[PDB]
RNA sequence: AAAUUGAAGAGUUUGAUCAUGGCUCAGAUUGAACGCUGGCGGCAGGCCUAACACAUGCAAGUCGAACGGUAACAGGAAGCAGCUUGCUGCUUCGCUGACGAGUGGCGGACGGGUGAGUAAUGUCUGGGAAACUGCCUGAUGGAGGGGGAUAACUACUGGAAACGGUAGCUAAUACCGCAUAACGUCGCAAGACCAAAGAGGGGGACCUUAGGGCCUCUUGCCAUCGGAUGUGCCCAGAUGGGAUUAGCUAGUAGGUGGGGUAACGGCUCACCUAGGCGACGAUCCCUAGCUGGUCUGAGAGGAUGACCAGCCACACUGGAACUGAGACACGGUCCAGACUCCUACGGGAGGCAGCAGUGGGGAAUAUUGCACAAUGGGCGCAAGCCUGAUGCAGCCAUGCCGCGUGUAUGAAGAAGGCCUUCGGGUUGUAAAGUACUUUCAGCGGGGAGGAAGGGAGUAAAGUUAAUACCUUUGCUCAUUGACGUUACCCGCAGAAGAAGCACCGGCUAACUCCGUGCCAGCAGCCGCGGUAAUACGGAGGGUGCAAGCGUUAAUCGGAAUUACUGGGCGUAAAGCGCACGCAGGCGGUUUGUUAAGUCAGAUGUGAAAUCCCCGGGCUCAACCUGGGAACUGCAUCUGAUACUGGCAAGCUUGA
């Protein structure tokens, strides 16, 4: 980089990338827990995993890592799949 | 944001400003939303040196447009007839 | 009201889809003669009511597949 | 940008007096006006139709002291303006400031009036104008400058002016050396020896 | 009112003619180039080729009113001393004005460049639904209580450098929980779940340490619903050439389900159906940024897309994502490649299609300038800083427009030149001479406008506990111009400093002599040159333009010579050898109906600029500018029904 502000922006963006990546992995792990519970066919476990998942995606959407529409999509899809497990 | 400012037209050493509403990001003489007046700084006597559509300006200000300093001064001068 | 086209079904072999030919009558820009032009549209046909040769009635909607952005309103005439 | 050669050769080529001299003498006593200039000037010129059109246009140009680019612009303006194109062209030529000064009589010739205009000795509506091609509007006042009122050539031009016909579209006071351009001259008020339709046809070739 | 005032031919085939038919010329124009020549000014324009390679300088920062801090320098405070009797110099303290480096916010996605790619992925016109949107703006509510880090810094250390490594300390409007949770998210519902940040000015009782949470004000933070703007997406019509490219396509076409996106969608995956496009030209090949517009044309058309503005695409080449409201990012990141460079040989650095400039290519295209004074943009409460945007300046007759290079008189019709039938004629009022003026250039003096604002004071009003702060409105005081020796005005001097280029047989305005002798040469065509050349070359004279004039290139015109307007086919080029016939084009006559074509009106849109009309300002003009007209189109709505089309019923004259 040739401009001082560009250099600082690169440093800041790398730090932001690490932070974002850890949060994104965490959220994905919880969603995958819900999906695995649905796959196993255990409705109670699926509901428990969904309950643990919901605040995480909501908080991430509020923080701006994902969008509100994406959080809503996750919640709606998982609720629809869980309700059919009966 | 939306702003009300002057676009410089005319000739060399003889500027003539068009008072326009525009997205502030556009170039000074570029894309604009609506033309609302003009201002000639070298207008001769008995010649209209400033004209503004105050109704349109007020409409855009109510919609949330900002105003450049020169346009604000021109509005003040026009209102002080 | 709603803008709306009317045409003739030229294919119905797709599942819930039809091809509709719309005819326009326009003056030739140079020679002035009125000529016929055809536009073929992919139309969503739920219940698969339409058949080849029927005169059908279509409107514009959101995309439904790669080539489908129109949907069937009613069947004006049946072959 | 100005013809600076002998003046009577132009009138000899055009076969008529172009008023390029003051008029204190006779054109016949000053030159062989009936003879075209040059070694072969005694020959009888058979002129084609293009030649006739060209000679008429050149005659008008030499009368008013206008070069070709300006004259073509005058013709374009005359064609653009509503009405008869040839009459519009003549009116535009007569509206020139140097011509107006000459007709008012402050200059013995159009060249002298042009020099007076150029040297900042002429005022229009109370402002100094030194553009020979300035267009004079109706009700305008053309006056001699106070520092130029003492010039003897102005008095000579004034005493030569009344020896000719008085233009009826102007109102001149020689005591104060100032005139009013009452209105644009009509076609009738201009010379009948000018065939402007030839110029109009020439510019359509 | 006004805004469609518009249309020329000529030469050449023949012994001659009429026709046909090509070729050639006169016009206008240009980002032009070249040759000759060259005075001034105004406005504009200036790498069309190598999207070739680039030395050097500059083109993006800013905020201390978010934060820890103190590298400076400037004060304040303590001591000492040459002391020069309190002026100086050296140390200790961030205590203040401030501020290097650092954390954090915002900007860097704008502004600027280029046209490589792109033939519809784009662009233009008109519609549309399944979306997000920083800064700005409206409304309703919140802004409680905690925690763990980390740069800077300190110590040690690796490396030539670039760049790191280890340990320890610290702050926030950096980061993360907890609480709060409804016009928000999920859900039929019940229910479940999600946020935040402080800073600054002033102050009495200062409720407590001279500060603050004690009050007030300003500003900032969070949630939701709106506005505005911007962006993403879908559809129809239009937008080059080639058929000596006729078949193309397997995520291909559609469906269901899962995933994915801000959002619809084969966007992606699994399965099912076997579809989808194409002679109304698919696929393939060549060329190409598109538009408003520009040139030409009487128009219809034809050609074109430089400058200005809108849209798109690209940023050394290929690929990728990260951050972010927004980028798959010209002056950011990563990988690979080619070149250039540094190296201690381990390893590192770079991207002018930003402005200026260099080399190179080319027939050809400019200065390594001044200033942020104005307009606009970034950050900032502001002051202000940054801004090769922009405003200006330099170079170039590149274009357009204006002006000057003098005016009047002057026969001796002077000399000299050229021609001469030797009489004379022409150059020619031309010159000389005589009277005059002095634009422009030169010199000296005066002198607008582009300046709005901002800063200090004040008085009033609004706020509050407060004559405090803050805001607003007036008034007062000093100021802000790169251009710049500005435009412009006045004075001095003296015609004094200022004319060339092409052509002259016909088209085509303009004629003689001499030289040469099918030679030298000219030439757009017809042609010219053979010893009396108006055609070659010089001269005299003349013609046309004129600070320009010629030549070359290129487009339209003339060319009704691709003919829609507006042509032809017996013999000039041209009727398939003759038919049948699908698609296609066309359709006798009457009534009813429909209203698709057609017609009328209205509404929305058709950006601004450009063109045109009427005006205004630069002394005029070019140029700038107000309003209108126009944008001949598209869509929608409402009407008309003669004609064409659809539908229904007929009729008999075509069959
Ligand atoms: Cu090394
Ligand atoms: K910063
Ligand atoms: K679908
Ligand atoms: K006319
Ligand atoms: K011939
Ligand atoms: K011919
Ligand atoms: K022949
Ligand atoms: K014969
Ligand atoms: K940014
Ligand atoms: K291109
Ligand atoms: K908190
Ligand atoms: K406070
Ligand atoms: K507050
Ligand atoms: K696909
Ligand atoms: K699908
Ligand atoms: K799908
Ligand atoms: K045209
Ligand atoms: K065009
Ligand atoms: K590329
Ligand atoms: K940019
Ligand atoms: K500025
Ligand atoms: K003589
Ligand atoms: K004040
Ligand atoms: K001889
Ligand atoms: K025809
Ligand atoms: K209709
Ligand atoms: K009908
Ligand atoms: Mg790097
Ligand atoms: Mg000129
Ligand atoms: Mg012959
Ligand atoms: Mg280029
Ligand atoms: Mg700088
Ligand atoms: Mg600092
Ligand atoms: Mg935060
Ligand atoms: Mg919570
Ligand atoms: Mg084109
Ligand atoms: Mg789609
Ligand atoms: Mg290209
Ligand atoms: Mg024509
Ligand atoms: Mg372009
Ligand atoms: Mg390059
Ligand atoms: Mg992101
Ligand atoms: Mg891009
Ligand atoms: Mg960038
Ligand atoms: Mg660069
Ligand atoms: Mg450059
Ligand atoms: Mg070269
Ligand atoms: Mg001068
Ligand atoms: Mg002023
Ligand atoms: Mg002739
Ligand atoms: Mg001879
Ligand atoms: Mg010759
Ligand atoms: Mg033609
Ligand atoms: Mg013919
Ligand atoms: Mg024959
Ligand atoms: Mg024949
Ligand atoms: Mg036959
Ligand atoms: Mg037949
Ligand atoms: Mg019929
Ligand atoms: Mg327009
Ligand atoms: Mg109008
Ligand atoms: Mg009918």
Swiss-Prot record, chain A:
<dbReference type="Pfam" id="PF01649">
    <property type="entry name" value="Ribosomal_S20p"/>
</dbReference>
<keyword id="KW-0699">rRNA-binding</keyword>
<keyword id="KW-0687">Ribonucleoprotein</keyword>
<dbReference type="InterPro" id="IPR036510">
    <property type="entry name" value="Ribosomal_bS20_sf"/>
</dbReference>
<keyword id="KW-0694">RNA-binding</keyword>
<dbReference type="GO" id="GO:0003735">
    <property type="term" value="F:structural constituent of ribosome"/>
</dbReference>
<comment type="subunit">
    <text>Part of the 30S ribosomal subunit.</text>
</comment>
<dbReference type="InterPro" id="IPR002583">
    <property type="entry name" value="Ribosomal_bS20"/>
</dbReference>
<comment type="function">
    <text>Binds directly to 16S ribosomal RNA.</text>
</comment>
<comment type="similarity">
    <text>Belongs to the bacterial ribosomal protein bS20 family.</text>
</comment>
<dbReference type="GO" id="GO:0000028">
    <property type="term" value="P:ribosomal small subunit assembly"/>
</dbReference>
<dbReference type="GO" id="GO:0070181">
    <property type="term" value="F:small ribosomal subunit rRNA binding"/>
</dbReference>
From Swiss-Prot, chain B:
<keyword id="KW-0687">Ribonucleoprotein</keyword>
<dbReference type="GO" id="GO:0015935">
    <property type="term" value="C:small ribosomal subunit"/>
</dbReference>
<comment type="function">
    <text>In-frame fusions with the ribosome maturation factor rimM suppress mutations in the latter (probably due to increased rimM expression) and are found in translationally active 70S ribosomes.</text>
</comment>
<dbReference type="GO" id="GO:0003735">
    <property type="term" value="F:structural constituent of ribosome"/>
</dbReference>
<comment type="similarity">
    <text>Belongs to the bacterial ribosomal protein bS16 family.</text>
</comment>
<dbReference type="GO" id="GO:0004520">
    <property type="term" value="F:DNA endonuclease activity"/>
</dbReference>
<dbReference type="InterPro" id="IPR020592">
    <property type="entry name" value="Ribosomal_bS16_CS"/>
</dbReference>
<dbReference type="GO" id="GO:0002181">
    <property type="term" value="P:cytoplasmic translation"/>
</dbReference>
<keyword id="KW-0255">Endonuclease</keyword>
<dbReference type="Pfam" id="PF00886">
    <property type="entry name" value="Ribosomal_S16"/>
</dbReference>
<dbReference type="InterPro" id="IPR000307">
    <property type="entry name" value="Ribosomal_bS16"/>
</dbReference>
<comment type="subunit">
    <text>Part of the 30S ribosomal subunit.</text>
</comment>
Curated annotation (Swiss-Prot), chain C:
<dbReference type="GO" id="GO:0005737">
    <property type="term" value="C:cytoplasm"/>
</dbReference>
<keyword id="KW-0687">Ribonucleoprotein</keyword>
<dbReference type="GO" id="GO:0022627">
    <property type="term" value="C:cytosolic small ribosomal subunit"/>
</dbReference>
<protein>
    <recommendedName>
        <fullName>Small ribosomal subunit protein uS17</fullName>
    </recommendedName>
</protein>
<keyword id="KW-0694">RNA-binding</keyword>
<dbReference type="GO" id="GO:0070181">
    <property type="term" value="F:small ribosomal subunit rRNA binding"/>
</dbReference>
<comment type="similarity">
    <text>Belongs to the universal ribosomal protein uS17 family.</text>
</comment>
<comment type="function">
    <text>One of the primary rRNA binding proteins, it binds specifically to the 5'-end of 16S ribosomal RNA. Also plays a role in translational accuracy; neamine-resistant ribosomes show reduced neamine-induced misreading in vitro.</text>
</comment>
<dbReference type="GO" id="GO:0019843">
    <property type="term" value="F:rRNA binding"/>
</dbReference>
<dbReference type="GO" id="GO:0000028">
    <property type="term" value="P:ribosomal small subunit assembly"/>
</dbReference>
<keyword id="KW-0689">Ribosomal protein</keyword>
<dbReference type="GO" id="GO:0008270">
    <property type="term" value="F:zinc ion binding"/>
</dbReference>
UniProtKB/Swiss-Prot annotation, chain D:
<keyword id="KW-0699">rRNA-binding</keyword>
<keyword id="KW-0046">Antibiotic resistance</keyword>
<dbReference type="GO" id="GO:0003735">
    <property type="term" value="F:structural constituent of ribosome"/>
</dbReference>
<dbReference type="GO" id="GO:0000028">
    <property type="term" value="P:ribosomal small subunit assembly"/>
</dbReference>
<dbReference type="GO" id="GO:0006353">
    <property type="term" value="P:DNA-templated transcription termination"/>
</dbReference>
<dbReference type="GO" id="GO:0031564">
    <property type="term" value="P:transcription antitermination"/>
</dbReference>
<dbReference type="InterPro" id="IPR022801">
    <property type="entry name" value="Ribosomal_uS4"/>
</dbReference>
<dbReference type="InterPro" id="IPR018079">
    <property type="entry name" value="Ribosomal_uS4_CS"/>
</dbReference>
<keyword id="KW-0889">Transcription antitermination</keyword>
<protein>
    <recommendedName>
        <fullName>Small ribosomal subunit protein uS4</fullName>
    </recommendedName>
</protein>
<dbReference type="InterPro" id="IPR005709">
    <property type="entry name" value="Ribosomal_uS4_bac-type"/>
</dbReference>
<dbReference type="GO" id="GO:1990145">
    <property type="term" value="P:maintenance of translational fidelity"/>
</dbReference>
